[PDB]
Amino acid sequence: VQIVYK
Amino acid sequence: QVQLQQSGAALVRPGTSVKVSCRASEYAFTNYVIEWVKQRPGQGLEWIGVINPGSGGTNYNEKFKGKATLIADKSSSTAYMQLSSLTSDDSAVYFCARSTYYSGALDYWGQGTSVTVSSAKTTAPSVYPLAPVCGDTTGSSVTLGCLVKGYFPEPVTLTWNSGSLSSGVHTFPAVLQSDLYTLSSSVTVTSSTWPSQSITCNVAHPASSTKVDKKIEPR
Amino acid sequence: QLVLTQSSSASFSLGASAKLTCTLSSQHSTYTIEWYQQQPLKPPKYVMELKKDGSHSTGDGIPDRFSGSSSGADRYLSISNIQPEDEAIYICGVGDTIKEQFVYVFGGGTKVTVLGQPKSTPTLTVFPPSSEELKENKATLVCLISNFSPSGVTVAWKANGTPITQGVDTSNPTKEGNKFMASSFLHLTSDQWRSHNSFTCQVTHEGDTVEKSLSPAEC
Ligand SMILES: [N+]
DSSP, rough: OOOOOO | OEEEEEEOOEEEEETTEEEEEEEEESOGGGGGGGEEEOOOTSSOOOEOOOEEEETTEEOGGGGGTEEEEEEETTTTTEEEEESSOGGGOOOOEEEEEEEEESSSOOOEEEEOOOEOOOOOOOOOEEEEEEEEGGGGGSSSSEEEEEEEEEEEOOOOOEEEETTTTTTTTEEOOEEEEEEEEEEEOOOOOOTTTTTOOEEEEEEEGGGGTTTEEEEEOOO | OOEEEEEEOOOTTTTTOOOEEEEEGGGGGTTTTEEEEOOOTSOOOEEEEEEESOEEETTTTTTEEEEEEETTEEEEEEEEEGGGOOOOEEEEEEEESSOOOEEEEEEOEEEEEEOOOBBOOOOOEEEEOOHHHHOOOOOEEEEEEEEEEESSEEEEEETTTTTEETEEEEEOOOETTTTEEEEEEHHHHHHHHHHHSSSSEEEEETTEEEEEOOOOOOO
């Protein structure tokens, strides 16, 4: 799945 | 208003470094991240990287890993992108933009910083008076011109009769051919005004500490 | 592998309905994307976030003319009653975190043209070469294009009514009040200027053509 961590 | 304000236009030489600044205001600096976007002049957007101000963590597009260095200062609420080893490829508009830790939306964008990597040398313009060919002198109005050819860098200031001619003036932004700028300005007066009264364009090139006044004479 | 493919830069009538497509790479079918609007010489603006189910959340000052929808890997931006201000390049973006490494990628953009806009036809001013410049064995013909809206023009020079394409520098259109202005320069030798019957500056705008010719000949 799409994962967005910055 | 959420705002990001970047440093100004930069004209630098190949092989050099540049440092663009991105100052955040009216939002919590360390509750969001800063991302940087390249745009070459006729091309699409290219993503460079992101700095997490609160963590100091960086993520970068692989292409810019040896080119861009991203840093943020919490105490100044300011984000910086250092470009190294500048080639003419590095010549673009660089944007900063706000994003969240956990979603993709670049929701607010800086104004941008034009970075120009150029070798062009400082050149005073040749100024020419433009009078109409005889076919263009039989109207109720008459339009005169000024050609400012082969100058570098920007800008030039152009006025007519030292600013006493203000309406019916159209001053066109410069075209760039081979690292020299050219521009033209027109002024439209009633045919009863010229040539009976004197019309002169005043061209100053601050970079070369030069000014030229060209009187428009009938051809 | 993370790839955004945008449908072909297309045109819509003023007040018609537009449907742009941003298609995800097969394996990234489920992904949330962002739409961005870039207007002439403006920073990009965040338009919306759009999810697999077609649910969406729009950015600051985006009218409710803009909605989103999804079908498999396809992400759609729909503009109802399209306006002149909607003229822009629409760019999609998508984020993902692969190896704890975050990457953002943009599509190539879709240039959106709004047809049948309020039309102001260009004024041409064409200047011959100055005596001074001719004495230097050179000749710049100047075409000044003003008082037009919307901004889209092309410029063609003619020599004795045949195409001349070498030595032409044509500006982009820029704002001048509530209209646009552009300039074009045709660099000749003094012999080329003297040896021809006529030169033409020919401007196209919204299906119209305006032209202004001048001659070296005596009146
Ligand atoms: N499209």
